[PDB]
Amino acid sequence: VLQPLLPRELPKLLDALNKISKYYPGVIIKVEESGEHVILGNGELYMDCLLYDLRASYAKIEIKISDPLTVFSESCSNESFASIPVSNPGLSISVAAEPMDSKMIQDLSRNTLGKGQNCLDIDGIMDNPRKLSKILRTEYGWDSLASRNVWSFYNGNVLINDTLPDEISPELLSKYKEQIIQGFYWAVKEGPLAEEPIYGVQYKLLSISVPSDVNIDVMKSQIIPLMKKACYVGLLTAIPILLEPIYEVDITVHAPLLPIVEELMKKRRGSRIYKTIKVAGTPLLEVRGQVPVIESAGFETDLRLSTNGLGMCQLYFWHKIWRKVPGDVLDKDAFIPKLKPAPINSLSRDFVMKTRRRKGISTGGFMSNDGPTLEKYISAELYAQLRENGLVP
Amino acid sequence: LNLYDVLELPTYDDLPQIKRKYRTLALKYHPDKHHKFHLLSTATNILTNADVRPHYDRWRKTNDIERNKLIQKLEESESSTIDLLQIQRHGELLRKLKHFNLPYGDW
Amino acid sequence: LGKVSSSFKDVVEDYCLEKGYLISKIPNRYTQLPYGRDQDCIVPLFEIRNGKKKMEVALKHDILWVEDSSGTFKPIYLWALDL
Amino acid sequence: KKVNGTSYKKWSFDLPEMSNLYRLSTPLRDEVTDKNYYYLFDKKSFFNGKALNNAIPGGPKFEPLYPREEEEDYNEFNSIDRVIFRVPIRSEYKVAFPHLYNSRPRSVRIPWYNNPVSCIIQNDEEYDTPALFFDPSLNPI
Amino acid sequence: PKDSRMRLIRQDVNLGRAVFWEIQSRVPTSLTSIKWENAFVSVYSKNN
RNA sequence: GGAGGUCAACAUCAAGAACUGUGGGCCUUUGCCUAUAGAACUUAUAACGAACAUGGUUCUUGCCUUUUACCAGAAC
Ligand SMILES: [Mg+2]
Q1: Nearest Cα residue in chain B from C10
Q2: Positions 33-92 in D, CB within 7 angstroms of strand F
Q3: Inter-chain CB proximity D77 and A69 less than 8 Å
Q4: Listing from the earlier edge strand, what are the strands of the sheet with A2-4?
Q5: Angle at B9 between CA B3 and CA B13, to 5 degrees
Q6: Domains, chain A, ranges and CATH?
Q7: C or N terminus of chain D, fewer CB within 10 Å?
Q8: What are the CA-CA distances from residue D62 to residues D42, D66, D108 (Å)?
Q9: Which of residues 40-99 of B touch C (CB under 8 A)?
Q10: What CA dihedral angle connects C62, A194, A335 and D80, to 10 degrees?
Q11: Among residues A327, A354, A82, A73, which one has the least CA distance to residue A201?
């Protein structure tokens, strides 16, 4: 997070960030409501290369810089007891959502052409739904009916239709399908909790209600936002959760120093090591492991020192793994340590209650405490019924 | 190089004065005693006729032009040196209704 | 006012729904903002279309800002928007 | 052959001599065979130590070079409510990646980063071990 | 230190200067002189 | 004529990553463009020295009666 030190010099800093975005392609620069500028880069050394370029060559001003932080994502664990319908009441929608099978996602993150027996990446939508359905039913033990039912997908997730009026009126919906996918992309690009991307969440469309007389341009606009709220509402009852990136760490050490390495891992809290590979011919070991993105702030130098210069590390994302943060995303009673690292029992309530404060979605005098609440969309009256049965925590 | 510069002399001289100038220079830089004189002869040719001398001198001035530029720069420099509340408030009211849920008026 | 749960943007969205105009985030582009202070805020902006017309709005505090023709944003009344 | 002349500049030697001199001088020889051993001990890490007023646990202590820290600016930017306290951001990090972890560096230099992890292997034990031999340290291939 | 210092939040600050404003007013400037400079206001808040 | 010298004098050694000469074209010698020949020594984790001292002025400190003598940082 950047801020220019002397505020009157902001118009210079902007003009440098337009350069950097060009020169370093991988960088992604965002500007927020707070006006906080978010730099997004591959890792430690890369941020260093920027910030040196940004202080030295391009914008000669000096700038204040935050602690290294990470990017989260938002997902659903569980199902949607509720299957509620939300209408912006000529249109009443009910959208279920469930987790995706780990294998499926694992084959999405890697775009794949389905060569031989490999599971095809869903990107072939233009292909025969019979071929694609053959792929799904073949590989996954995937549903037979749903295989045909599928409409469309996006990077993190897929959309599916299960409902009677599809059997009653497939055409009238086929009109507005292209409308629903817009609501879908809109839905995924943001999120219910942190307004951060939804990932690994399978959306099954349970119902849609359409008004009498239909409409011309009312059906055009009115569908998108209502569909969006249908996707948020679909998620929040599924057991939602806050995703944190995990770096695949690759380490190279002399043999006898292996124990030291292990210690560091046990300290980080994110991470553990999958493999220890003898390197033929040399006195080396490749230790492959994993660590969360948010936990990796200082890792490399910790290692490189601790072994007295023997050894090495690299942190990288390819797999774009993610993992649940051990807390429960919506809870009022989480312990906020206030200047200490929070106890693992609740880290998710922390991360979300922070990102929310950063992204100005939630307003408090100082520490706002507004949860992402299902209640706001349903209307109380449904909400009151829901709370009675313990559906809402 | 100016005709005055060529002769190494200082800058409304009369036809008589023009003759006298040449005479003075001739005594000083007499070619038979000591290329430059080519300039002297030409300028004298027009200077010896008061009309040509006057017209030629008619056409430091440029440098005056420099003064004009300086003046223009000075003029530019010195002279140059020498609802919102209502809107946000209305928006605040509008949100309050949405919160209270009271139906919006047709704004 | 801090007490009030609802957030503006919501209001804007609601207004847009009646109009039938659609508001989209637009990720990269941003506009420098002039607010009372002798300083300019920077805010992301979104574009709303009635059919195939795109105009861009940035909201800071509790206001909607729409750019003047030559350039630079001007605050406007919410009722005052017709595209 | 062995030297220029009586003027005595520009020496030139042979291998075996340099082997003997190299042998004799062991108590005063540098002994450290890789760059990577000095990680935060090179010069540039010490300069960066001074300018930023930090210390490497074995390094020297200097004066501030920028005596005034006292000025503090208050804005929502770094506010606690918006920060996640994970990992301490302890001092050694500041010298390694000086532009990142250290807000507002000045007179800072670029530290050199990494070297290729010397696997160098030698035997000073037996003189009759061959020159090329597969050392028990290595993995079995 | 910063953490355990008084935090700066609108409710807080505005209460402080409000109180100081009224008491500032009560005493006439002729008898004594009460300046905001010399004064210290500490606010105990749900936030503080 | 070859090897040298704890011999000397005179050149040159911190810069558009950088030298010099020459051929041709334009402006009017400079300068720009084009063609060609030769570039010792010193430089990239930057420099003649794989080493390492002192002084002056100006600020900031530190000892603290005052001056020399000083404390430890910076710029020139
Ligand atoms: Mg005296």
Answers
A1: B95
A2: 35, 42-44, 62-63, 65, 67
A3: no
A4: A28-31, A37-40, A2-4, A63-65
A5: 75
A6: 1-71 (3.30.70.870), 72-78+240-360 (no CATH), 89-239 (no CATH)
A7: N
A8: 16, 11, 15
A9: 83-84, 87-88, 90-92, 94-96, 98-99
A10: -60
A11: A73
Amino acid code (one letter) for A344? I
Q: What are phi and psi of D5, to 5 degrees?
A: 170, -170
Q: Give the position of tokens 């590390």.
A: A313
Q: Which residue of D has its CA nearest to A308?
A: D37
Cα gap A47→A59, rounded to integer Å: 16
Nearest to A142 by CA among A227, A204, A81: A204
Positive or negative, the Cα torsion across A260, A264, A267, A270?
A: negative
Half-sphere exposure of A62 (CA within 13 A, CB side): 8
Please write down the HEC assignment for all residues of A123-146.
HHCCCCHHHHHHHHHHHHCCCHHH
**Distance from the alpha carbon of residue A200 to the mean position of ligand 1, in angstroms:** 87
Q: Of A298, A291, A284, which Cα lies nearest the Cα of A255?
A: A284
Mutate to test the interface with C, among B85, B89, B93, B94 (most CBs of C within 10 A): B94
C75: closest CA of chain B, how far (Å) = 7
Site of tokens 């409304």: B12
Nearest residue to A202 via CA among A262, A122, A117, A279: A122
Q: Which residue in the set C2, C22, C27 is minimally distant from A224, CB to CB?
A: C22
Q: Which amino acid is at B27?
A: L
Of A372, E2, D52, nearest to C5 by C-alpha is A372
Whether E48 has its CB under 8 Å from any CB of chain A: the answer is: no
- Residue E9: its chain A contacts at CB < 8 A? 365-366
Q: Assess contact for C63 and C36: CB atoms under 8 A.
A: no
The two tokens of residue A84 are 């509620």
Distance CA C55, CA C31 (A): 13
Residue A109 CA to residue A116 CA, distance in Å, equals 19
Nearest chain A Cα distance for residue D19, angstroms: 27
Contact A328, A239 (CB under 8 A): no
Q: Measuring from the CA of residue D45 to each C1' atom, give the nucleotide at the shortest distance.
A: F45
The neighbouring-strand residues paired with A324 are A243
Query: Which residues are within 8 A (CB) of B40 and not within 5 positions of it... i.e. 6 or more apart?
Result: B6, B7, B22, B25
Show the tokens assigned to A374: 């299902």
Beta carbons of D97 and A68 less than 8 Å apart: no
Q: Which residues contact D10 (CB under 8 A, 6 or more apart)?
A: D3, D4
A residues 323-352 lying closer than 8 A (beta carbon) to D? 337-342, 350-351
Task: Confirm or reject contact between A189 and chain C (CB < 8 A).
Answer: yes
Tokens representing residue D93 in the block: 């990090």
Please answer yes or no on whether B104 and C14 come within 8 Å at the CB atom.
yes
In whole angstroms, what separates CA A38 from the centre of its chain?
Answer: 17
Pairing of strands A157-161, A201-208: parallel
Rounded to the nearest 10°, the torsion over CA B85, B88, B94, B97 is -80
What Å resolution does this PDB entry report?
3.5
Give the span between the Cα atoms of D36 and D46, in whole angstroms: 16
Structure tokens belonging to residue B89:
């408030």
Which nucleotide does the CA of D107 lie closest to, via C1'?
A: F74
Minimum distance, in Å, between the CA of residue C36 and any CA atom of chain A: 15
A246: left (phi over 0), alpha (psi -120 to 50) or beta: beta
Structure tokens at A169: 């009126």
Cα atoms found within 13 Å of the Cα of residue A287, Cβ hemisphere only: 24
Angle at D100 between CA A306 and CA D105, to 5 degrees: 110
